[PDB]
């Protein structure tokens, strides 16, 4: 059995990690022009998810622990196209705090982004330890977007995620946009795409979606308001179990925030054993909370 035990970066405590959080958050505030003024928040969230989403619950391969996205096999994964922008953003942060592990930095990037975009607090635990190049998972473990609800359900079960967790996690698609050159899909999902809200669910239910081909010859669902949904997004209103949960989050952002926060922490922690002596999860203050 392959076990990854969280090991606190030697001599570091909450306050050290809050400094890393603050550095990420200050750079997010500064680099506001990225991606036609969306900023780096969305791509940092996606990065944190993609480095975690290689996990296989069956044998504990992949996952966030080893920081293996730093190795070319994984950063050149076609599924990861575009995330190099997030990695470059993080580079000066890692230079300022060389003591932090790669897995901790990439996951913390995602937590910082959600919180600074006015999303829920996400508790975060340190202790991921870099592992060598030969532990890098092969490409092909991240999901396709052209598929239906059955595929989504099956895919997420490899990450030990159930229906509620799947629907909550997908609400992160409120953020950012699809880019044709990265994924073969093009367009934003709504108007509020650098503030964390339940817009994904509202738009799914309330927009008039038309199935169209895009300029890469892939099918996607497009609205007259200039928004789109991936086939896997749209599957959440096709499957009856998913649809019920989509309605719940559309009606109650607070519930969405609570369930997202739990699911996102779990996603970022899959594969990691936290010893009983480990620090409690950290809840970082926002820059606003600190007057910074
Ligand atoms: C069935 C599962 C999923 C599929 C098929 C999927 C697919 C995609 C695709 C195709 C893109 C566009 C990438 C690009 O063109 O730049 C995207 C973007 C994004 N994904 Fe997902 N995704 C899934 C789940 C998730 C999850 C679980 C999260 C995080 C909790 C997430 C967060 C994001 C974010 C924040 C973006 C915007 C990135 C940006 O604007 O640069 N996705 N996703
Ligand atoms: N619903 C369109 C979408 C998908 C992924 C990321 C942003 C927006």
Swiss-Prot record:
One of its GO terms (cellular component) is mitochondrion. The record marks 46 as: Transition state stabilizer. The keyword Lipoprotein does not apply. The active site is at residues 50, 189. The modification Phosphotyrosine is found at residue 151. Binds 1 heme b (iron(II)-protoporphyrin IX) group per subunit. The keyword Acetylation does not apply. CCP1 precursor is processed by the rhomboid protease PCP1, which cleaves the N-terminal hydrophobic transit peptide. The m-AAA protease (composed of YTA12/RCA1 and YTA10/AFG3) is required for CCP1 maturation: m-AAA protease promotes membrane dislocation of the CCP1 transmembrane segment within the transit peptide to ensure the correct positioning of CCP1 within the membrane bilayer, allowing intramembrane cleavage by PCP1. Heme b binds at residue 173. Keywords: Heme, Hydrogen peroxide, Iron, Metal-binding, Mitochondrion, Organic radical, Oxidoreductase, Peroxidase, Phosphoprotein, Transit peptide. GO terms for molecular function: cytochrome-c peroxidase activity; heme binding; metal ion binding; peroxidase activity. It is found in: Mitochondrion matrix; Mitochondrion intermembrane space. Its EC number is 1.11.1.5. GO terms for biological process: cellular response to oxidative stress; hydrogen peroxide catabolic process; response to reactive oxygen species. Its cofactor is heme b. Disulfide bonds: none annotated. Present with 6730 molecules/cell in log phase SD medium. Forms a one-to-one complex with cytochrome c. Belongs to the peroxidase family. Cytochrome c peroxidase subfamily. Destroys radicals which are normally produced within the cells and which are toxic to biological systems. This is Cytochrome c peroxidase, mitochondrial. It comes from Saccharomyces cerevisiae (strain ATCC 204508 / S288c) (Baker's yeast). The lineage of its organism: Eukaryota, Fungi, Dikarya, Ascomycota, Saccharomycotina.
């Amino acid at each position: 059995t392959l076990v990854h035990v969280a090991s606190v970066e030697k001599g570091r405590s909450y306050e050290d990690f809050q400094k890393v959080y603050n550095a990420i958050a200050l750079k997010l505030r500064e680099d506001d022009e990225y991606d036609n003024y969306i900023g780096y928040g969305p791509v940092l969230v996606r990065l944190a998810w993609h480095i975690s989403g290689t996990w296989d619950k069956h044998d504990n391969t992949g996952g966030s622990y080893g920081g293996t996205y730093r190795f070319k096999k994984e950063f050149n994964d076609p599924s990861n196209a575009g995330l190099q922008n997030g990695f470059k953003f993080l580079e000066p942060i890692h230079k300022e705090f060389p003591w932090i592990s790669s897995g901790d930095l990439f996951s913390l990037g995602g937590v910082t982004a959600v919180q600074e975009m006015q999303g829920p607090k996400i508790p975060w635990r340190c202790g991921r330890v870099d592992t060598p190049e030969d532990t890098t998972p092969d490409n092909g473990r991240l999901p396709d977007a052209d598929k239906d609800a059955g595929y989504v359900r099956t895919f997420f079960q490899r990450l030990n995620m159930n229906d509620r967790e799947v629907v909550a996690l997908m609400g992160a698609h409120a953020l950012g946009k699809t880019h044709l050159k990265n994924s073969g899909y093009e367009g934003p999902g709504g108007a509020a795409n650098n503030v964390f809200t339940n817009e994904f669910y509202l738009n799914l239910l309330n927009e008039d979606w038309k199935l169209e081909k895009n300029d890469a010859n892939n099918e996607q669902w497009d609205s007259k308001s200039g928004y789109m949904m991936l086939p896997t997004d749209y599957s959440l209103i096709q499957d009856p179990k998913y649809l019920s949960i989509v309605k719940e989050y559309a009606n109650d952002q607070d519930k969405f925030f609570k369930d997202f926060s739990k699911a996102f922490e779990k996603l970022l922690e899959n594969g990691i054993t936290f010893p009983k002596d480990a620090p409690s999860p950290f809840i970082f203050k926002t820059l606003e909370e600190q007057g910074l």
